[PDB]
Amino acid sequence: KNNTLWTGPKPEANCIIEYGKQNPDSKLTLILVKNGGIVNGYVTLMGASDYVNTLFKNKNVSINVELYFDATGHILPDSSSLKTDLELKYKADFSARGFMPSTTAYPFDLPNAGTHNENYIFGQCYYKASDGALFPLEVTVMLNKRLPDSRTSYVMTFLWSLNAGLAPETTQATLITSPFTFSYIREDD
């Protein structure tokens, strides 16, 4: 009851990966579930353009998704990679502050006070290549460390890194990052 904030189970292209592109080129599935004092997160990315679906023709690739939220936990679409706000599973006015990363646990760096390296979550997911070969993707989640502007209250970024000895593909193949799950200390409701 009021505990899931997401993109939907199978969204249409809603995310921009290629710098300078005006329209979505990928499908970001992001699910944030409230579970006690923590949020259980689920993230997957699917390519929806020739650019995104040919990135894995290279053995060294970095994919960035930046999410910026206002004071009531709503996506700022102008600056964020995700161009459509998240919605509640049973949805439409509401405060999604309780789904946000805690500024107590994950603070914002202050000039001359030193960096907050406790704001990163590292893990791994995979890319299953068209030939069936399995490539690991190194994942970095950064919570609130640095703001992009004066309009943002919370930050959640994702980075998928491919660092292989050989390229996964020689042709266009749908980019799919296997589901990556993570948990963080949430802000007060």
Add this chain to the structure above:
Amino acid sequence: KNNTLWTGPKPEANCIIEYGKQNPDSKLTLILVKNGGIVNGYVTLMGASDYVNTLFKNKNVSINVELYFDATGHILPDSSSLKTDLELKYKDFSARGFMPSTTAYPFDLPNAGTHNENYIFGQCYYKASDGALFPLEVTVMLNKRLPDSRTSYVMTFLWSLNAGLAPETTQATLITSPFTFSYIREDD
């Protein structure tokens, strides 16, 4: 509170690994917990036969567990590796809400298309009798292909050992360390 569908915390031999065997040869612990729009899963396998407990005498091993469910999320024991249906933590009723979403994880349709979004990959470990720790590459396949006309949902597990040397030279209880995963669940 109607949110855990499981095998029990420490089940008796309930799963068949060896092809052609008629009776259980392993103990599958599977816990499926409803948590908002997702299911939080927990899986571990323990060997319960000489065959299963001597598999790790080889450097290359694949262990497959196939689970097939009906329209109300109940195990089809004839076709599944698990020979006993899952049960709620408190005593029927529909387990549809614990099933993998056919929207998020569809079934491949004959012309053009594989749904590679139906795989969850991760890792767990085998602690050998000598104390060496071996990684096991885990693949979970949700839906994607049906075995027959009786099945509505699919959940398969594969544990792969691909080592430079065999973990064992003798029989030792096979134990895969706990593997946790999450998936978008079907409507209640």
Add this chain to the structure above:
Amino acid sequence: KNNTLWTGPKPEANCIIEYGKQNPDSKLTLILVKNGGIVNGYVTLMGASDYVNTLFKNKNVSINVELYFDATGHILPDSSSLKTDLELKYKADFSARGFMPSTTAYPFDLPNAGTHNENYIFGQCYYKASDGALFPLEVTVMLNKRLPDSRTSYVMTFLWSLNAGLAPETTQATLITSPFTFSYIREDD
């Protein structure tokens, strides 16, 4: 709703790492959330002494945290690494038995019977070095193999291992283990 037993989102030094030290030298963040028949755990360690914050000047380091609980799931501070009991996020006169690792799933070994290897959870987290290098830490969780004494009912230990070919640091830097998440079969409420 009585479902989170934790240290707090950002605790003060509450843990002892250095053998023979009498006062806390580290900050252990431990969050235990009840979710059906399982507990969803979250653990992070931050150094709070010159000793702990110079451990990564070595390429081979092992960090151990031992937690011993009574029959009602309360920390025994005399023997445990954590020197302050866990508390409920919302609700001190409570029972935390339901947050404990199951003695059915994770039994205690018996003399001459051969060990319970089902009691371990293995995984990985990282240390982000002052120069941005990312070092993996091999994590082992134990749960209930052996009791330290006649006062303990439940056990939960953590081991972070660094086994690098070079040292992450040449100077003092705050030790931070990136968030490690795990799940275990819980005891009855």
